[PDB]
């Protein structure tokens, strides 16, 4: 099926509370939406959520680079996923975030053509429960404890805590949370490159007592070579996030035994195609994988959830941010049940789209 036109939308939706990580603060999910049209009249959807401090992209850059990509894809076959992923790479280096949106949409089309839901199209099956954590933004320790409580009250059984401040302050944060929410609720932490190699090790041995599940990206992504040293000095397992974007990154981290687990995100791997490679590597190395994301809407996370069913090595899930939107614009897609359990659509394709005339209100451009 030939690609006849692609539409791009700027989709800014405000968050209830601002989202806060060690790298900065965000008040909106400024996302970019991608719709691919085929001659047969099929439509594939894809979304991406640029994070300036991690992707190096913004909604503004995504919206423009996306147009470069669209131009190149017009006239090609939406089924040649590999050929087209390659075609985009030949057009512009990096820019994984926007690329992933196109890649996701292509798979949507492909699965639709096969008459399967994405997860089945990818060779996965529903043989496990998908359970999301919920994130406590990095703030003053009382505020953080309060949020942790509210989160447990809402029924969530896993808490993700954003750290990355000074050693003293992060420990106070974790304590005040364990103190105000209990020792039985499972919790995981994420520094977003916030610590130096030194502070990391000191803070991580100082936190072991509080029983934490794993720590994401303790130090700068440029310092990944110091990861093995930290892994061996610390009981808490460490999970590579920013340090693990594509499959080359994965292979390299494994080769030097840098971390215990990966955080896999479609935007970092420039789509599903390469995410699959990362998964295979993590399989061959018996490494648990957490699937996550950024501020994608339920549509984006619906893609993540499909991929999440592809392998038994995947077993942790960070699919929380859509719950922070002031308004949910998504039609279909994954549904959040109690305890933070997620159900994946069974209909053909991605199994999600956007609410009627939500898109018509958005700033858009149309390639061909
Ligand atoms: Mg992370």
UniProtKB/Swiss-Prot annotation:
Among the GO molecular function terms of this UniProt record, one is:
magnesium ion binding
Q: Where does substrate bind?
A: 135, 160-162, 265, 318-320
Cite the entry's keywords alphabetically: Isomerase, Magnesium, Metal-binding
At the top of the EC hierarchy, this enzyme's class is isomerase
SUPFAM superfamilies in the cross-refs = Enolase C-terminal domain-like, Enolase N-terminal domain-like
Which Pfam families has this protein been placed in?
A: MR_MLE_C, MR_MLE_N
Q: What else is known?
A: Part of a large, functionally divergent protein family. Protein modeling and substrate docking were used to predict the substrate specificity, prior to biochemical analysis.
| Similarity section | Belongs to the mandelate racemase/muconate lactonizing enzyme family.
Its recorded name reads: D-Ala-D/L-Ala epimerase
Q: Supply the gene name.
A: tfdD
């Amino acid at each position: 099926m030939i690609i006849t036109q692609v539409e791009l939308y700027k989709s800014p939706v405000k968050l209830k509370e601002p989202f806060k990580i060690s790298l900065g603060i965000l008040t909106h999910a400024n996302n970019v939406i991608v719709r691919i049209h085929t001659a047969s009249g099929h439509i594939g959807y894809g979304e991406c959520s640029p994070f300036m401090t991690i992707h190096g992209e913004s909604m503004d850059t995504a919206f423009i680079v996306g147009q470069y990509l669209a131009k190149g894809l017009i006239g090609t076959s939406c089924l040649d996923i590999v050929s087209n992923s390659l075609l985009m790479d030949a057009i512009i280096y990096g820019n994984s975030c926007i690329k992933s949106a196109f890649n996701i949409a292509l798979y949507d089309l492909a699965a639709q053509h096969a008459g399967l839901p994405l997860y089945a199209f990818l060779g996965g099956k529903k043989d496990k429960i998908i359970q999301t954590d919920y994130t406590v933004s990095i703030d003053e320790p009382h505020k953080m404890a309060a949020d942790a409580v509210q989160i447990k009250k809402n029924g969530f059984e896993i808490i993700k805590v954003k750290v990355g401040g000074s050693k003293e302050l992060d420990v106070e944060r974790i304590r005040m949370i364990r103190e105000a929410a209990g020792d039985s609720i499972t919790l995981r932490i994420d520094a977003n490159q916030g610590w130096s190699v030194e502070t990391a090790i000191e803070t991580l041995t100082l936190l072991e007592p509080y029983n934490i599940q794993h720590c994401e990206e303790p130090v700068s992504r440029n310092l990944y070579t110091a990861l093995p040293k930290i892994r061996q000095a610390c009981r808490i397992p460490i999970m590579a996030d920013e340090s693990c974007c594509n499959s080359f990154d994965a292979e390299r981290l494994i080769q030097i035994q840098a971390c215990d687990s990966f955080n896999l995100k479609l935007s970092k791997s420039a789509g599903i195609t390469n995410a699959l490679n990362i998964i295979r590597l993590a399989e061959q190395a018996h490494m648990p994988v957490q699937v996550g994301g950024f501020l994608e809407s339920r549509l984006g996370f619906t893609a993540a959830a499909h991929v999440a069913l592809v392998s038994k090595t995947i077993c942790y899930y960070d699919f929380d941010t859509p719950l922070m939107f002031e308004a949910d614009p998504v039609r279909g897609g994954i549904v959040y049940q109690q305890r933070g359990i997620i159900e994946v659509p069974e209909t053909a394709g991605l199994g999600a789209g956007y609410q009627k005339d939500y898109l018509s209100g958005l700033e858009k451009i149309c390639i061909n």
